[PDB]
Design an enzyme around this catalytic site. Structure first.
Site, mmCIF file in Angstrom:
data_model
loop_
_atom_site.group_PDB
_atom_site.id
_atom_site.type_symbol
_atom_site.label_atom_id
_atom_site.label_comp_id
_atom_site.label_asym_id
_atom_site.label_seq_id
_atom_site.Cartn_x
_atom_site.Cartn_y
_atom_site.Cartn_z
ATOM 1 N N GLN A 66 -7.710 -7.288 -8.601
ATOM 2 C CA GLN A 66 -8.824 -8.233 -8.538
ATOM 3 C C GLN A 66 -8.454 -9.561 -9.191
ATOM 4 O O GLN A 66 -8.811 -10.640 -8.683
ATOM 5 C CB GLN A 66 -10.068 -7.630 -9.191
ATOM 6 C CG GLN A 66 -10.498 -6.298 -8.584
ATOM 7 C CD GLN A 66 -11.995 -6.083 -8.613
ATOM 8 O OE1 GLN A 66 -12.595 -5.690 -7.614
ATOM 9 N NE2 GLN A 66 -12.607 -6.329 -9.766
ATOM 10 N N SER A 96 -3.845 -3.728 -16.738
ATOM 11 C CA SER A 96 -4.841 -3.530 -17.779
ATOM 12 C C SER A 96 -4.515 -2.277 -18.572
ATOM 13 O O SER A 96 -4.142 -1.250 -17.999
ATOM 14 C CB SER A 96 -6.249 -3.412 -17.189
ATOM 15 O OG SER A 96 -6.359 -2.261 -16.371
ATOM 16 N N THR A 132 -2.666 4.135 -13.690
ATOM 17 C CA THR A 132 -1.628 3.322 -13.064
ATOM 18 C C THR A 132 -1.438 1.988 -13.773
ATOM 19 O O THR A 132 -0.367 1.386 -13.658
ATOM 20 C CB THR A 132 -1.932 3.075 -11.580
ATOM 21 O OG1 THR A 132 -0.981 2.145 -11.047
ATOM 22 C CG2 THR A 132 -3.342 2.522 -11.362
ATOM 23 N N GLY A 133 -2.448 1.513 -14.499
ATOM 24 C CA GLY A 133 -2.312 0.289 -15.262
ATOM 25 C C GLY A 133 -1.535 0.422 -16.553
ATOM 26 O O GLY A 133 -1.264 -0.597 -17.193
ATOM 27 N N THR A 137 -15.149 1.544 -20.884
ATOM 28 C CA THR A 137 -15.532 2.167 -19.621
ATOM 29 C C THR A 137 -14.702 3.415 -19.342
ATOM 30 O O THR A 137 -14.479 3.768 -18.183
ATOM 31 C CB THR A 137 -15.396 1.184 -18.458
ATOM 32 O OG1 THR A 137 -14.017 1.057 -18.097
ATOM 33 C CG2 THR A 137 -15.948 -0.184 -18.835
ATOM 34 N N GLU A 139 -9.199 5.688 -23.176
ATOM 35 C CA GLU A 139 -8.532 4.395 -23.306
ATOM 36 C C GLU A 139 -7.572 4.322 -24.490
ATOM 37 O O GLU A 139 -6.460 3.793 -24.309
ATOM 38 C CB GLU A 139 -9.580 3.278 -23.406
ATOM 39 C CG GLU A 139 -10.095 2.783 -22.070
ATOM 40 C CD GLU A 139 -10.843 1.471 -22.183
ATOM 41 O OE1 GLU A 139 -11.193 1.080 -23.316
ATOM 42 O OE2 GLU A 139 -11.080 0.827 -21.140
ATOM 43 N N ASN A 155 -12.478 -8.205 -22.862
ATOM 44 C CA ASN A 155 -13.635 -8.440 -22.003
ATOM 45 C C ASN A 155 -14.850 -8.915 -22.791
ATOM 46 O O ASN A 155 -15.639 -9.715 -22.277
ATOM 47 C CB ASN A 155 -13.982 -7.171 -21.225
ATOM 48 C CG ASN A 155 -13.190 -7.034 -19.938
ATOM 49 O OD1 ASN A 155 -12.264 -7.800 -19.674
ATOM 50 N ND2 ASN A 155 -13.562 -6.057 -19.121
ATOM 51 N N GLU A 214 10.954 -22.522 -22.360
ATOM 52 C CA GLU A 214 10.494 -23.224 -23.554
ATOM 53 C C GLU A 214 9.313 -22.507 -24.197
ATOM 54 O O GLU A 214 9.181 -22.529 -25.426
ATOM 55 C CB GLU A 214 10.134 -24.682 -23.240
ATOM 56 C CG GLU A 214 10.945 -25.323 -22.115
ATOM 57 C CD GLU A 214 11.023 -26.836 -22.217
ATOM 58 O OE1 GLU A 214 10.071 -27.520 -21.793
ATOM 59 O OE2 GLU A 214 12.048 -27.346 -22.714
HETATM 60 N N1 GTP Z 1 -11.503 -8.528 -16.445
HETATM 61 C C1 GTP Z 1 -11.504 -7.527 -15.572
HETATM 62 N N2 GTP Z 1 -11.236 -6.243 -15.998
HETATM 63 C C2 GTP Z 1 -11.235 -5.215 -15.119
HETATM 64 C C3 GTP Z 1 -11.510 -5.440 -13.782
HETATM 65 N N3 GTP Z 1 -11.444 -4.255 -13.140
HETATM 66 C C4 GTP Z 1 -11.135 -3.291 -14.036
HETATM 67 N N4 GTP Z 1 -11.011 -3.872 -15.269
HETATM 68 C C5 GTP Z 1 -10.668 -3.198 -16.532
HETATM 69 O O1 GTP Z 1 -9.890 -2.044 -16.284
HETATM 70 C C6 GTP Z 1 -10.189 -1.042 -17.230
HETATM 71 C C7 GTP Z 1 -10.071 0.334 -16.590
HETATM 72 O O2 GTP Z 1 -8.732 0.567 -16.223
HETATM 73 P P1 GTP Z 1 -8.169 0.085 -14.796
HETATM 74 O O3 GTP Z 1 -6.929 -0.754 -14.979
HETATM 75 O O4 GTP Z 1 -9.233 -0.669 -14.039
HETATM 76 O O5 GTP Z 1 -7.798 1.447 -14.031
HETATM 77 P P2 GTP Z 1 -7.125 1.375 -12.576
HETATM 78 O O6 GTP Z 1 -6.458 0.039 -12.364
HETATM 79 O O7 GTP Z 1 -8.156 1.660 -11.512
HETATM 80 O O8 GTP Z 1 -6.036 2.552 -12.609
HETATM 81 P P3 GTP Z 1 -6.544 4.074 -12.632
HETATM 82 O O9 GTP Z 1 -7.424 4.295 -13.838
HETATM 83 O O10 GTP Z 1 -5.362 5.007 -12.679
HETATM 84 O O11 GTP Z 1 -7.340 4.320 -11.376
HETATM 85 C C8 GTP Z 1 -11.596 -1.321 -17.726
HETATM 86 O O12 GTP Z 1 -11.666 -1.246 -19.130
HETATM 87 C C9 GTP Z 1 -11.924 -2.721 -17.248
HETATM 88 O O13 GTP Z 1 -12.291 -3.550 -18.328
HETATM 89 C C10 GTP Z 1 -11.785 -6.728 -13.345
HETATM 90 O O14 GTP Z 1 -12.029 -6.936 -12.160
HETATM 91 N N5 GTP Z 1 -11.781 -7.771 -14.244
HETATM 92 MG MG MG Z 2 -7.449 2.820 -10.107
#
Ligand code: GTP
Ligand code: MG
Ligand code: TA1
Ligand code: ANP
Ligand code: GDP
Lengths: 433, 451, 388
Positions: free
Chosen positions: B15, B140, B145-146, B179, B183, B206, B254
């Site tokens: 996103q 994130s 996966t993040g 969320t 975490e 956030n 730099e």
């Molecule tokens: N700023 C912002 N944060 C987001 C957004 N979408 C998800 N997040 C953050 O992502 C966190 C949850 O982990 P994600 O990285 O979304 O998980 P994922 O990418 O779907 O990977 P999986 O959990 O394995 O499915 C939350 O704490 C959110 O704050 C977004 O559109 N904007």
């Molecule tokens: Mg996901």
């Protein structure tokens, strides 16, 4: 591509499954004949989650209807959505279990289980990427509970790495339609606690209370109960089909809500719920949905959450909404009711938001709660169980089918151990001397 | 040819990438379909810059992007969205289950069998590229996966490429808002990879973005779109140096030279000064002094941490628009004369300055006001440890009883990984505490002339 | 009474491949502390742990602080045999990744000068009895041997079709397994023959480390029973105890063994079982702590026994008035460093005691400090006495 195989055993399971398939067909705009007559393009984007394709652009649900009494099968086929199901999936026998778990699990179901597993395997081998199963049934009954537990055990043997879901209707304190509910429920819990990833906990009492005090229905019937169960059953898997800002798979819910393997019994709930004439007196906002979700009387398990503490909860919202409102409201709920949440989990509120609401609503939400108070339910059954087992009240019918008393003792001990793993993580901790 | 590769991993990264690529397409005049009416109307130019977009013979421009995620849905939205023709047909989607908020599942079990395909395209882009400047990885913390897949990808990229700068943009867990239950486990587990392999990691929270949206922008109910747009503006300000002309241009090398005193303290905060609505755009001058002062306010920080509780190790200001060095010099002096802003005694200069002529662009349908001047500040300070400390606390509260551990160990990990991650994070916190200490009290031995 | 844990960690010598290679040792040990250095980080600062017993079998012909096999036996197995003769269960857990020394610890070599725990235990058991054998003291010994693979129980001794056996809970006797072959033994030779036949049937797999690795926890149960004839007309069973000898499989990481499919499933199940077992044993030691600390608390709490079949079947041996010991094997080779560290992290369990800081001042700086202090003392003495 995630997709789910649906099974429904017993009369209660078949009724709830019929209502569920009607609800899902309405949600996806599927005609009773199987053709599509919807409007939005997103309805077909993930139709494979619950349906298979046919030659003439027809969609057949992935249902496997099983029961030992042909009467329920005939009732289902002679219905509004009877023709939607595949005829070959109507596996059934004769000479029903007779409210006897032994017949359902050891004597009568042992023969039909082969055909049922054959059809299940046929449906499973054509899957693109099988995620999990969903079994709808009742524990206090006969063929339903027994065949359901047997199928659960067999499928978990065959497919250990797949998620398993079960939507079970248990006995209730006051309403009790069958004499031998305690024994059946006890053996069913003994199987379920060992062979299931997630169990959803519903009873007729809470549904009746919701119908009378919230929906204000003068003469509720089983259709409304199945309607509510269908609403929550659709809400739980809404995120698999439609897109959203923050997605939630079934495995995500399993990981977030199950701190330990044996504690996977959940109390469901649905919002909003209003009694027709009051609809114009209420404003639909995120605070209102949260307030109705965390309200004790809206719980569907007839266990007061105030008599215990939440290990975890999940909120699956549907509709267009602001993430700040959701986060602030859940944080406010956690902070205000500080004594009702376990303290060694820093944050015990999973949240997910889907951007597609239900068909007739601007917003909706599904609540799931893993809390200690559920023990109470088990305790009740245990009491009744011993009250019937000390004198061997109705045991000769079970022992005539090949079972022995040691299995009953095992089931009682297993439930007693489960009740403890819920108290341990409850009463606020303290010091000593 | 200052060419960078943008990798997006996870839903948050995808996103964010959508918002960012909307911003770059608006900035460079490229339409969604991928074509460029600007060159046809004018006759030619270098506006189809090689920094983000690669040109083909038909006049079409494709971004140098690699979108990756395990959920089909999040990028299936992109394939059916407005920008379907902009990207290459390949989008690197595992038609399988998600990582399920599980670092082990995203790193060991399902992260495999996709890491190859992903790395192959990350090559077909590098080979197409010449004079590659660096990688920008968006993801994130707290996600499956993040956290796991990004860790594996950074490991493989360090093994293969090595010397190229790898900037990281990521979202940290907030102190109060969350969320997901697991975490802390994922965030602590990925700390080793983001410490060892990343060259500089920009972190956002956030809650801070929500506060900025509520107060400055007068948006009572923000959503992820606004936060993603703010992060996109940050990244655009960062990368604007190597696209447009300016009096003082600052490359990524730099950034690494100035903002990283030692290898293990490459965790700077970020902020954007002129976050202001159209209604409040009037009654304000928005001079260089005002934006420079606003950059240092504790309230405007994009991570919920107080700079007043720590000392500034380094600062880097990137100005855009009608800015001339007299005002930035005066503002820097004015900031140096304030007592609340404490600097480490071992960094007497303490400021990097860059100026660019291209003013910020406004996204149609957005909420930021059109302005003549803007500044993006990066700030390497010691206050960040406080945030880490909070996170560390949460981890113990969930690791004392081994809750939610059977899910992780069932995919390949053991408790030793948890202990190693916690010890590594403690060592990082100790290093941050040590480096922020003043220099040795004047080693005034008072030697009298000759020994 | 309760049940305490005796944690012993031992280090083995080099082998032919390690002796031929120029690998360095990495494990130092002293008293009740074990220190490990990273070969890849010469300046990583050494990591220390502390246990109840620290055994240095690294140098075979050593004569000072050498951990002889008989010494370890006198430390653990003799006490456990004495406790078993008292009529209380005793459990011995073995742990160690392949190439660590578990098999040597649990079996020993054939020259009978360096014997494993089980041979010495069996010899002492048969001897102690053959002596106590009077007119009113009947003794009976029986042996069973089973394996746990993917949370399913299998019989090792029986050559029948290796299906999954059912697990039941007798109301008085606790958990047990149905259709489990049980045999009586007369001498240590019969026990060894039965063990060889069972071990030939164990599920073994090839990994990136070794071509033969254990894929399934195993349990060799020795059941010992004593009948007494008092000064009466009745002969009554005095007590029944169990000596449990288990071969817990070793933990692993998917990075070390990248095999897919069945191997990953086996590794996941093994890791789950080991995590559960570690939880149970540490929690059971928690009782000791709390109890001794105050003096009474009652609340039995709830020790998780049903979370895995391994801990469920070993419920009687683990809990109650019993004793348990844990022997972990360490590899001295530098190349296996991380794995050795992992074993230490698993050996740190069952108490998690404080090892404190470990560091030594430089010997030259030590001499400088001592000389400066001595010079100051002697100068002060001379000045005080007026002779300086
Ligand atoms: N700023 C912002 N944060 C987001 C957004 N979408 C998800 N997040 C953050 O992502 C966190 C949850 O982990 P994600 O990285 O979304 O998980 P994922 O990418 O779907 O990977 P999986 O959990 O394995 O499915 C939350 O704490 C959110 O704050 C977004 O559109 N904007
Ligand atoms: Mg996901
Ligand atoms: C038209 C209008 O605004 O009136 C509403 C309405 O009055 C209320 C009270 C509806 C109404 O529901 C009930 O009266 C009801 C009675 C017994 C059991 C369950 C519901 C409604 O009937 C239900 C109906 O709901 C839907 O259309 C949903 O999409 C719903 N549909 C079905 O379940 C369904 C029913 C028959 C055939 C096929 C599907 C749904 C909910 C979740 C997931 C999928 C679908 C709506 C809009 C209304 C009426 C018509 C009065 C409610 O319905 C739900 C659960 O969505 C009950 O409380 C909600 C909130 C609504 O305000
Ligand atoms: N104290 C010791 N003295 C001499 N050799 C020892 C000692 N401890 C272990 N060994 C050696 O260890 C080897 C046997 O154990 P080893 O094969 O390393 O354990 P393992 O079986 O691979 N681990 P596992 O398979 O999980 O039980 C032999 O080469 C022995 O000589
Ligand atoms: N919600 C709901 N519950 C039902 C319905 N019919 C029966 N039940 C419940 O199911 C229990 C009887 O189980 P039953 O369906 O007869 O089991 P079976 O005979 O093995 O299929 C009773 O206690 C009822 O509370 C129904 O239509 N809706």
């Amino acid at each position: 591509m995630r997709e789910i195989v649906h099974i429904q055993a017993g009369q209660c399971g078949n009724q709830i499954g019929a209502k569920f398939w009607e609800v899902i067909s309405d949600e996806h705009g599927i005609d009773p004949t199987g053709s599509y007559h919807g409007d939005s393009d997103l309805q077909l984007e993930r139709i494979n989650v619950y349906y298979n394709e046919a030659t003439g652009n027809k969609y057949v649900p992935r249902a496997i209807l099983v029961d030992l009494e042909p009467g329920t099968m005939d009732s289902v086929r002679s219905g509004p959505f009877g023709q939607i199901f595949r005829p070959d999936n109507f596996v059934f026998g004769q000479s029903g279990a007779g409210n006897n778990w032994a017949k359902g699990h050891y004597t009568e179901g042992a023969e039909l289980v082969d055909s049922v597993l054959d059809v299940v395997r046929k449906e499973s081998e054509s899957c693109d990427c099988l995620q999990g199963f969903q079994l709808t049934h009742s524990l206090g009954g006969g063929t339903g509970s027994g065949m359901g537990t047997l199928l659960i055990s067999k499928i978990r043997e065959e497919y250990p790495d797949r998620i398993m879901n079960t939507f079970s209707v248990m006995p209730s304190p006051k309403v009790s339609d069958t004499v031998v509910e305690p024994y059946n429920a006890t053996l069913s819990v003994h199987q379920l606690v060992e062979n299931t990833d997630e169990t959803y906990c519903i009873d007729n009492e809470a549904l009746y209370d919701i119908c009378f005090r919230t929906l204000k229905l003068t003469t509720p019937t089983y259709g409304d109960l199945n309607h509510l169960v269908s609403a929550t059953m659709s809400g739980v898997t809404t995120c698999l089909r439609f897109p959203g800002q923050l997605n939630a798979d079934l495995r995500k819910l399993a990981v977030n809500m199950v701190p330990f393997p044996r504690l996977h019994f959940f109390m469901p709930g649905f919002a909003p719920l209003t009694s027709r004439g009051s609809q114009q007196y209420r404003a639909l906002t995120v605070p209102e949905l949260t307030q109705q979700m965390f309200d004790s009387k809206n719980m569907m398990a007839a266990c007061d959450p105030r008599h215990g503490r939440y290990l975890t909860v999940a909120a699956i919202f549907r509709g267009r909404m602001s993430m700040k409102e959701v986060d602030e409201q859940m944080l406010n709920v956690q902070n205000k009711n500080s004594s009702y949440f376990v303290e060694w989990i820093p944050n015990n509120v999973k949240t997910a938001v889907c951007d597609i609401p239900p068909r007739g609503l601007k917003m909706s939400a599904t609540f799931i709660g893993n809390s200690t108070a559920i023990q109470e339910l088990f305790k009740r059954i245990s009491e009744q169980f011993t009250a019937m087992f000390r004198r061997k009240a109705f045991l000769h019918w079970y022992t005539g089918e090949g079972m022995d008393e040691m299995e009953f003792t095992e089931a009682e001990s297993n439930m007693n151990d489960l009740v403890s793993e819920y108290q341990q993580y409850q009463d606020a901790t303290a010091d000593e001397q | 040819m200052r060419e960078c590769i943008s990798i997006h991993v996870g839903q948050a990264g995808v996103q964010i990438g959508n918002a960012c690529w909307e911003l770059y397409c608006l900035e460079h005049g490229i339409q969604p379909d991928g074509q460029m009416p600007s060159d046809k109307t004018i006759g030619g130019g270098d506006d189809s810059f090689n920094t983000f977009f690669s040109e083909t013979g038909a006049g079409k421009h494709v971004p140098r992007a690699v979108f990756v995620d395990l959920e089909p849905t999040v990028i299936d939205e992109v394939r059916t969205g407005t920008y379907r023709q902009l990207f290459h047909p390949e989008q690197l989607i595992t038609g399988k289950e998600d990582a399920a908020n599980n670092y082990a599942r995203g790193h060991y079990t399902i992260g495999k069998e996709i890491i190859d395909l992903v790395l192959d395209r990350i090559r077909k882009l590098a080979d197409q590229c010449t004079g590659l400047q660096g990688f920008l990885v968006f993801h994130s913390f707290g996600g499956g996966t993040g956290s796991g897949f990004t860790s594996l990808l950074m490991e493989r990229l360090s093994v293969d490429y090595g010397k190229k700068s790898k900037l990281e943009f990521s979202i940290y867990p907030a102190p109060q808002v969350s969320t997901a239950v697991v975490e802390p486990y994922n965030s602590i587990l990925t700390t080793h990879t983001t410490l060892e392999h990343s060259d500089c990691a920009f972190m956002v929270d956030n809650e801070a973005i929500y506060d900025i949206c509520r107060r400055n922008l007068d948006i009572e109910r923000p959503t992820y779109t606004n936060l993603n747009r703010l992060i996109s503006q940050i990244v655009s300000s960062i990368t604007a140096s190597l696209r447009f002309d300016g009096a003082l241009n600052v490359d990524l090398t730099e950034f690494q030279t100035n903002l990283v005193p030692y290898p293990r303290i490459h965790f700077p905060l970020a902020t954007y000064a002129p976050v202001i609505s159209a209604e409040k755009a009037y009654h304000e001058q928005l001079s260089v002094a005002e934006i420079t002062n606003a950059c240092f306010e504790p309230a405007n920080q994009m991570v919920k941490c107080d700079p007043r509780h720590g000392k500034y190790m380094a600062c880097c200001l990137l100005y855009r628009g009608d800015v001339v060095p007299k005002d930035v010099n005066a503002a820097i002096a004015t900031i140096k004369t304030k007592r609340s802003i404490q600097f480490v005694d071992w960094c007497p200069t303490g400021f990097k300055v860059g100026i660019n002529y291209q003013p910020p662009t406004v996204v149609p349908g957005g909420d930021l006001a059109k302005v003549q001047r803007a500044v993006c500040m990066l700030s390497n300070t010691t206050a960040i440890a406080e945030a880490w400390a909070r996170l560390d606390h949460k981890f113990d509260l969930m690791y004392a009883k081994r809750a939610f551990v059977h899910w992780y160990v069932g995919e390949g990990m053991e408790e030793g990984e948890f202990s190693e991650a916690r010890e590594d994070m403690a060592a990082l916190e100790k290093d941050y505490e040590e480096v922020g200490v003043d220099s040795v009290e004047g080693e005034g031995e008072e030697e009298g002339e000759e020994y | 009474a309760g049940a305490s844990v005796k944690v012993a960690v031992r280090v083995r010598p080099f082998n032919s491949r390690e002796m031929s290679r120029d690998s360095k040792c990495i494990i130092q040990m002293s008293g009740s502390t074990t220190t490990i250095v990273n070969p890849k980080q010469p300046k990583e600062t050494p990591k220390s742990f502390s246990f109840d017993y620290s055994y240095w079998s690294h140098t075979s012909p050593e004569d000072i602080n050498y951990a002889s096999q008989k010494q370890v036996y006198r430390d653990i197995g003799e006490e456990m045999l004495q406790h078993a003769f008292e009529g209380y269960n005793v459990c011995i857990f073995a742990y160690g990744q392949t190439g660590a020394g578990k098999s040597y610890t649990m079996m020993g070599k054939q020259e009978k000068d360096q014997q494993g725990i089980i041979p010495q235990l069996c010899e002492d058991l048969f001897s102690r009895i053959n002596d106590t054998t009077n007119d009113n003291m009947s003794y009976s010994v029986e042996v069973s041997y089973m394996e746990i693979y993917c949370e399913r129980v299998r019989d090792l001794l029986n050559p029948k079709n290796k299906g999954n056996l059912r697990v039941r809970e007798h109301p008085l006797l606790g958990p047990y397994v149905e259709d489990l072959s049980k045999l009586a033994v007369t001498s240590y030779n019969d026990i060894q023959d039965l063990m060889d036949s069972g071990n030939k049937a164990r599920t073994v797999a090839a990994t990136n480390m070794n071509e033969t690795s254990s894929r399934s926890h195993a349990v060799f149960n020795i059941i010992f029973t004593q009948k007494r004839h008092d000064a009466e007309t009745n002969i009554t069973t005095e007590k029944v105890s169990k000596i449990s000898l288990v071969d817990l499989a070793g933990s692993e990481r998917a990075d070390s063994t990248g095999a897919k499919g069945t191997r990953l499933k086996e590794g996941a199940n093994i890791n789950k079982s080991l995590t559960t077992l570690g939880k149970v044993i540490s929690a059971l030691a928690e009782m000791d702590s709390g109890p001794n600390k105050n003096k009474k608390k009652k609340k039995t709490d709830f020790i998780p026994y049903r979370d895995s079949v391994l801990t469920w079947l070993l419920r009687e041996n683990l809990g109650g008035n019993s004793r348990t010991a844990m022997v972990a094997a360490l590899s001295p080779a530098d190349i296996n460093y991380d794995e050795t560290l992992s074993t230490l992290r698993y050996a740190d369990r069952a108490k998690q005691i404080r090892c404190n800081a470990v560091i030594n001042e430089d010997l030259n700086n030590k001499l400088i400090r001592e000389l400066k202090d001595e010079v100051t003392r002697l100068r002060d003495l001379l000045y005080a006495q007026g002779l300086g």
